Design a protein around this ligand. Structure first.
Ligand SMILES: O=C(O)c1ccc(-c2nn(S(=O)(=O)c3ccccc3)c3ccc(Cl)cc23)c(OCc2ccccc2)c1
Lengths: 260, 260
């Protein structure tokens, strides 16, 4: 246990890093998804023709799939930058640094994807675009079904009503998982996470006092996260045996080589 | 400001510098001179014994590369320590977040070189928080590109250490470097220079009181930031060559990400 002032200090630290590391915060995403801003209004893609006009303003299922893979790579870069700032992370064994990231980036991506989503769609191109869930759900053969459970998770997850400051600590807890497969020094990983959890517990208590057992309930959502990554990796594997024309990113190839 | 305030600011920064960096200059100096002897790497065999005995954090391809990379992991590790320290400089965290990021982005190299001198003498360099000592003859003698990559760090430390600065001098000098208002892309230079003029004020008084016998040490120390900039460009231009010359450098995709 740390003194509560130390945890408050840790939380502020991490919020600052998160702000610096991720250009599109939940705070900015919500201001776009709600409205009353002629300054911030997205272009909305709901069919093939509006997609064709989307390029001029900012095969189809592949074009969209590949574009998602490059946004994903962009996010691993941002998450890796953030992780580097978590107190203790860079002092870990170098091999374990990779393993935490190998197993953490996806669970973090979906968490952060939820900030860019509502029941009806998802922000793209750094807020400038909005692609509707119904349009994606209607893409051919294997795709389309690739996007829907993220929406199903995002709707429930977003009802916790967390903000960027809450999320910064929650992301950290994810990265610092000492039960990831193949870690060499689990002990120093748990000790760090024991601090992030303490920081998160306090942060949640103060920022959401009317919201009973949010800490518990937020920890339970990592159950949902694990399954989404399972279903997703099973899906990517099918496209790999179906589409031999297209490829993955070197960085992406690494995250999904082995893994539970 | 009143002299008591500069004495206070200097006391403040020394206190912060102590907590932020594991191995002070005072402690390194006690190690490099004499009076638990550090494990000494002076050739290929003693390095092989360095791991599996003291099992070093950064060194675990082939030998010269392994060492070259190990320096970069320590550098990344140190950047977090400097970032922690910067957060305590009065006023720093109250600046525009983009500018905090810019000041660190362009400052860490000069601070790393500066502090590297505290761990160096003419004959070698401390590693692993003092537990190791790697000889300059060994580093200087690594093959083709790598040998010459390490020797200038030593060439700098020897001249710099002839000023005979201590941690209380160095804490302010570091602060002055961070708060450099000529870094590219700053949005609000005024408050950065305002802070720098105070750190300079504290630095000038500190040197006068701590080194009264040493005329124009303030001046001579400002002249060394002329040196630092040229050494950092030389270094960066040198890394550029190794990246384009050595194809034996294949690290894990996620590692290259962390260590870029
Ligand atoms: O303890 C520390 O504070 C500490 C800080 C920096 C280095 C260190 N970094 N680099 S660098 O990555 O090229 C670099 C340098 C300046 C700016 C940017 C990047 C070095 C290159 C040569 C040398 Cl001799 C040292 C360094 C450090 O080396 C300890 C070490 C030496 C040999 C094997 C393993 C570890 C220690």
């Amino acid at each position: 246990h740390m003194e509560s002032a130390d945890l408050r200090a840790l939380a502020k630290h991490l919020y600052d890093s998160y702000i610096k590391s991720f250009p599109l915060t939940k705070a900015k995403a919500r201001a776009i998804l709600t409205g009353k801003t002629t300054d911030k209004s997205p272009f909305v893609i709901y069919d093939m023709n509006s997609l064709m006009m989307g390029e001029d303003k900012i095969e189809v299922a592949i074009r969209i799939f590949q574009g998602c893979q490059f946004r994903s790579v962009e996010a691993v870069q941002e998450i890796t930058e953030y992780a580097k700032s978590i107190p203790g992370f860079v002092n870990l064994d170098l091999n374990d640094q990779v393993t935490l990231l190998k197993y953490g980036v996806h669970e973090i991506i979906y968490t952060m994807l939820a900030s860019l989503m509502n029941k009806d769609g998802v922000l793209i191109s750094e807020g400038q675009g909005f692609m509707t869930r119904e349009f994606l759900k209607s893409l051919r053969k294997p795709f389309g079904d690739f996007m829907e459970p993220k929406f199903e998770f995002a709707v429930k997850f977003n009802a916790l009503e967390l903000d960027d400051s809450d999320l910064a600590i929650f992301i950290a807890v994810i990265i610092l998982s000492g039960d990831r497969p193949g870690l060499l020094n689990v002990k120093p990983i748990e000790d760090i996470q024991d601090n992030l959890l303490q920081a998160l517990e306090l942060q949640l208590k103060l920022n959401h006092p009317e919201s009973s057992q949010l800490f518990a309930k937020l920890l339970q959502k990592m159950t949902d996260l694990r399954q989404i990554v399972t279903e997703h990796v099973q899906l990517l594997q099918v496209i790999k045996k179906t589409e031999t024309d297209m490829s993955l990113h070197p960085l992406l190839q690494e995250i999904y080589k082995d893994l539970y």
